[model samples]
Target: RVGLTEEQKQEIREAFDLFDTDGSGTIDAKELKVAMRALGFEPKKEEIKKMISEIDKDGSGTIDFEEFLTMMTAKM
Candidate 1:
């Protein structure tokens, strides 16, 4: 299943935290945008938002690695 177990959720939350470059608060869209930019991507807000929305079956607003990897890798 393209979903995260409880353990994976915690791990991904931390990793996402690490990726949140700005000293701001929560890991929001901007944080992901920064991560993408770091990896040489322009980080289109609309596209990322749409992608996240699609994979986030739980409707958590944020995505887990299971969903993220599936979608992102397909793009690549």
Candidate 2:
């Protein structure tokens, strides 16, 4: 697993909370796009779909904070 600093983790959480506007505890594809943009990633639809499929362990078709963190750290 990638080791991230506390600051990096906080930033990831902030980004997740910001994009999770509905407070649904997860981010959909649309929100994932914007969140990725915020994190300096320019992801295509297929990329986003792959990301969701990879991290969306529960098959909710969305990303919760833990999954988001996993993706963020992996990117780093």
Candidate 3:
């Protein structure tokens, strides 16, 4: 499991909300890429795709809040 402080988690959530421009409760591939960048990551298309495939537990083809948190914690 990943360990993150409350502040770190909140920062991740803020980033998620900012990039979730559609407010669809999920971040699509393009949003995910930009969101990651906002959090200081420069992921390629393939990497972003792979991340969604792995973390998108419901096969929604998008990263939900929980999945986004999981990804951030794991990476950070």
Candidate 4:
């Protein structure tokens, strides 16, 4: 569990959905390309791949919401 209050869970869901534009179960580099550049920084494909790999626990080559939650909490 991410250990957030119920309300925070909804917040995380909304945030994830915003980037999961394809509405797919996981976020691939393509799905994150837009959001990544939205901040005015364009990460190379290899860099993005590395980033996804870091959180892709099941080695699925994508970041699911569960892994995403773990990633977010990890910084704290």
Candidate 5:
């Protein structure tokens, strides 16, 4: 669980929520890239797809906060 406390998770959720506009609970193709940039990961188009696809649970072609956190903690 990365030993992330509830407060840390809440802070992460707050930042993630800002990028997940429209209350979708997940960031889609439209915002995924932007979110990545915000995280300092300005990956190429192909890279972006690959990253998101790896975390795209439910096969929805998007990534929720949990997946985002997973990617950050796991892929780092």
Candidate 6:
């Protein structure tokens, strides 16, 4: 899902890979931390934890595809 177009599957894959860094299948604060550093922003662990918690509808410590898309789109 995530509104990923067929041609944009590569983007989805890359995003998932980045978000799921360490291949843990779950995105912890550390993974999100890396992603933020890559974007030139330094996110604190506590803030990241809070954000992940806020969007973690399942309390899984990761933003699922649907939630992730909503986040990405909201940045626009």
Error of 3 at 14 (Å): 0.6
Best of the candidates, TM-score: 2
TM-score of 6: 0.62
lDDT of 4 at 35: 61
lDDT of each: 0.59, 0.81, 0.81, 0.73, 0.74, 0.65
lDDT by residue for model 1 over 1-76, one digit each (tens)?
Answer: 5565667657656666576445343345555666677768866667888866776666275544455445444543
True lDDT of residue 48, candidate 3: 72
Write down the TM-score for model 1. 0.47
Order by TM-score, highest first: 2, 3, 5, 4, 6, 1
Candidate 3 at residue 33, lDDT? 72
Q: Give the TM-score of candidate 5.
A: 0.75
Query: Tens digit of lDDT per residue, candidate 4, span 1-76?
Result: 5467767777767777888888787776666677668746678877777777788878385678888777767742
Q: List the residue pairs that clash in candidate 2.
A: none
lDDT of candidate 3 over 1-76, digit per residue (tens): 5588899989989888888898988888778777668768878777777778898897387788898888788877
- If scored against the real structure, what TM-score would every candidate get? 0.47, 0.79, 0.77, 0.69, 0.75, 0.62
After superposition, the stretches of candidate 6 with alpha carbons farther than 4 Å from their true spots are: 1-13
| Model 2 Cα lDDT, one tens digit per residue, 27-68 | 887787777787788788787787688988873867889888
The predictions' CA RMSDs to the true structure, in order, are 5.8, 2.3, 2.5, 3.3, 2.4, 3.8
Flag regions of model 5 displaced more than 4 Å. none
lDDT against true structure, model 3? 0.81
TM-score, prediction 3? 0.77
lDDT of 2: 0.81
Using lDDT as the yardstick, the better of models 1 and 4 is: 4
Candidate 5 lDDT by residue in tens digits, 1-76: 4566778677777877887886788877777777778778757888777767788865387678888777656754
